[PDB]
């Protein structure tokens, strides 16, 4: 109970503001998004919870939240706004709800290139799906808050690499028509993880099919990239420094309407505070900002929008991004965007220093969360003590029941109950938590020396 929310207490306090008057109301029980959508999968495995809000104008809008805490679905006043999870004609791996949605991203090159999503992975036609299980989830009508943490995952179902990537994702509903992201990537392994994207996503091209940019100088007030940039281009008219805009982007409708749809996306202009800060954690020049489309329009319908932060995690450490969406009018949205870009900043999450509540092995066996005929994984014993959150070296305890024979096991490393005992064609361990794992579970945190 209170373990739990010690779990979260890594995140930033959210900023104080005061409050609003408009309902919001949150569910777990599927139901088909309508979604006009281009993948077969079921929307079932990926679905966590929906939240049945308003827009800027007092208008219905649903958000659907994944497992891992990415964002994959939006039900507005003109339709679905993520893009459809298109496959192209035999690619050979559909990307459901994994790839072209509102998600958080950590790029490592220490062994080689190996991603680490928070929503799943790349799977064939005919391979299951899988998706980063919701390891803890939080809801607070009151605050309109849900805070919940997910373990990154590579998106290929075999790797080199087992992600060592812990996903803190928060969405506060701080007005009609704003939600509050704060997205929280804690790096427990050894290695880095320097670029981040914070957020990747983008919107359906045949929804808003506007791309617009906020102005430098002249606040609330945007530049329509009438040169409708390519994803792939880059800085070939496709890339933009934070400092050189307003501070926030704009997705319309294609037309001249002046309160036509729109979502808006706030990355700050690169003033947030950098001295008094861990060096490591700020590995890039400033925070970029890549848009432009990719494939065709009526078909791949995505309008590529991606925040690269100045901020990377590094060993034992965790940095924090905390930006704003908004969806409703694109006048109204166009005047109120300003404000929350200049919200949006971000740090290190740093370590609370005072005391917590402590579980064991058995203690975790007592309370129902890890079954009786669980193992322990030869690196625990009964006299580790497992943490809330994780203090300096500490590294995530996990409860896995591995596909191999459902017997449950409790350890602190997942590499070694996924490896598949191949190799890589040049000669790597390969390993696939999702061809080992048939639940994970996350006891907490404690130290191996």
Same mark, same amino acid.
């Given at each position: 109970?209170?373990?739990?929310?010690?779990?979260?207490?890594?995140?930033?306090?959210?900023?104080?503001?005061?409050?609003?008057?408009?309902?919001?109301?949150?569910?777990?029980?599927?139901?088909?998004?309508? $979604?006009?959508? !281009?993948?077969?999968?079921?929307?079932? !495995?990926?679905?966590?919870?929906?939240?049945?809000?308003?827009?800027?104008?007092?208008?219905?809008?649903?958000? =659907?939240?994944?497992?891992?805490?990415?964002?994959?679905?939006?039900?507005?006043?003109?339709?679905?706004?993520?893009?459809?999870?298109?496959?192209?004609?035999?690619?050979?791996?559909?990307?459901?709800?994994?790839?072209?949605?509102?998600?958080?991203?950590?790029?490592?090159?220490?062994?080689?290139?190996?991603?680490?999503?928070? &929503?799943?992975?790349?799977?064939?036609?005919?391979?299951? *799906?899988?998706?980063? *299980?919701?390891?803890?989830? !939080?809801?607070?009508?009151?605050?309109?808050?849900?805070?919940?943490?997910?373990?990154?995952?590579?998106?290929? +179902?075999? !790797?080199?690499?087992?992600?060592?990537?812990?996903?803190?994702?928060?969405?506060?509903? +701080?007005?009609?028509?704003?939600?509050?992201?704060?997205?929280?990537?804690?790096?427990? #392994?050894?290695?880095?993880?320097?670029?981040?994207?914070?957020?990747?996503?983008?919107? =359906?091209?045949?929804?808003?099919?506007?791309?617009?940019?906020?102005?430098?100088?002249?606040?609330?007030?945007?530049?329509?990239?009438?040169?409708?940039?390519?994803?792939?281009?880059?800085?070939?008219?496709?890339?933009?420094?934070?400092?050189?805009?307003?501070?926030?982007?704009?997705?319309?409708?294609?037309?001249?309407?002046?309160?036509?749809?729109?979502?808006?996306?706030?990355? #700050? %202009?690169? /003033?947030?505070?950098?001295?008094?800060?861990?060096?490591?954690?700020?590995?890039?020049?400033?925070?970029?900002?890549?848009?432009?489309?990719? $494939? $065709?329009?009526?078909? %791949?319908?995505?309008? /590529?929008?991606?925040?690269?932060?100045?901020?990377?995690?590094?060993?034992?450490?965790?940095?924090?991004?905390?930006?704003?969406?908004?969806? #409703?009018?694109?006048?109204?949205?166009?005047?109120?965007?300003?404000?929350?870009?200049?919200?949006? &900043?971000?740090?290190?999450?740093?370590?609370?220093?005072?005391?917590?509540?402590? =579980?064991?092995?058995?203690?975790?066996?007592? &309370?129902?969360?890890?079954?009786?005929?669980?193992?322990? $994984?030869?690196?625990?014993?009964?006299?580790?003590?497992?943490?809330?959150?994780?203090?300096?070296?500490?590294?995530?305890?996990?409860?896995?029941?591995?596909?191999?024979?459902?017997?449950?096991?409790?350890?602190?490393?997942?590499?070694?109950?996924?490896?598949?005992?191949?190799?890589? &064609?040049?000669?790597?361990?390969?390993?696939?938590?999702?061809?080992?794992?048939?639940?994970?579970?996350?006891?907490?945190?404690?130290?191996?020396?």
């Amino acid at each position: 109970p209170l373990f739990q929310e010690q779990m979260f207490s890594l995140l930033p306090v959210a900023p104080d503001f005061p409050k609003t008057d408009f309902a919001v109301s949150t569910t777990t029980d599927f139901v088909p998004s309508k $979604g006009p959508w !281009s993948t077969t999968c079921s929307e079932e !495995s990926v679905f966590l919870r929906s939240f049945h809000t308003v827009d800027l104008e007092g208008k219905p809008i649903e958000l =659907r939240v994944g497992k891992g805490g990415h964002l994959y679905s939006i039900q507005s006043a003109i339709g679905e706004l993520v893009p459809p999870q298109w496959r192209h004609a035999n690619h050979k791996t559909v990307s459901p709800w994994n790839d072209e949605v509102w998600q958080a991203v950590a790029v490592t090159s220490d062994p080689n290139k190996v991603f680490v999503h928070q &929503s799943g992975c790349y799977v064939k036609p005919e391979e299951p *799906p899988f998706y980063a *299980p919701c390891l803890a989830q !939080s809801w607070s009508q009151e605050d309109k808050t849900f805070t919940m943490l997910s373990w990154g995952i590579v998106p290929q +179902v075999t !790797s080199t690499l087992v992600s060592e990537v812990l996903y803190y994702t928060r969405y506060r509903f +701080v007005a009609p028509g704003v939600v509050e992201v704060t997205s929280g990537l804690f790096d427990f #392994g050894k290695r880095n993880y320097l670029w981040l994207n914070t957020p990747w996503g983008g919107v =359906r091209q045949t929804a808003l099919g506007e791309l617009w940019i906020a102005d430098k100088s002249e606040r609330g007030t945007a530049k329509w990239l009438n040169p409708m940039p390519r994803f792939g281009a880059a800085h070939d008219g496709a890339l933009d420094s934070a400092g050189n805009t307003g501070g926030w982007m704009a997705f319309a409708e294609e037309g001249q309407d002046p309160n036509r749809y729109a979502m808006g996306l706030t990355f #700050g %202009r690169d /003033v947030f505070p950098t001295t008094g800060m861990n060096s490591a954690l700020l590995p890039r020049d400033k925070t970029l900002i890549r848009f432009g489309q990719a $494939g $065709g329009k009526e078909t %791949r319908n995505y309008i /590529v929008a991606v925040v690269i932060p100045r901020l990377g995690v590094i060993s034992g450490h965790g940095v924090w991004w905390r930006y704003y969406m908004a969806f #409703g009018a694109f006048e109204a949205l166009k005047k109120q965007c300003p404000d929350w870009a200049d919200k949006t &900043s971000g740090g290190e999450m740093v370590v609370p220093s005072i005391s917590s509540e402590t =579980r064991n092995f058995e203690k975790c066996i007592e &309370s129902g969360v890890i079954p009786r005929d669980a193992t322990l $994984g030869s690196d625990l014993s009964r006299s580790h003590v497992f943490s809330p959150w994780p203090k300096p070296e500490y590294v995530p305890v996990f409860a896995f029941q591995l596909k191999k024979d459902s017997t449950w096991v409790v350890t602190t490393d997942p590499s070694k109950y996924a490896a598949l005992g191949e190799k890589d &064609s040049k000669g790597q361990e390969l390993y696939s938590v999702a061809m080992s794992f048939s639940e994970i579970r996350l006891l907490g945190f404690t130290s191996i020396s």
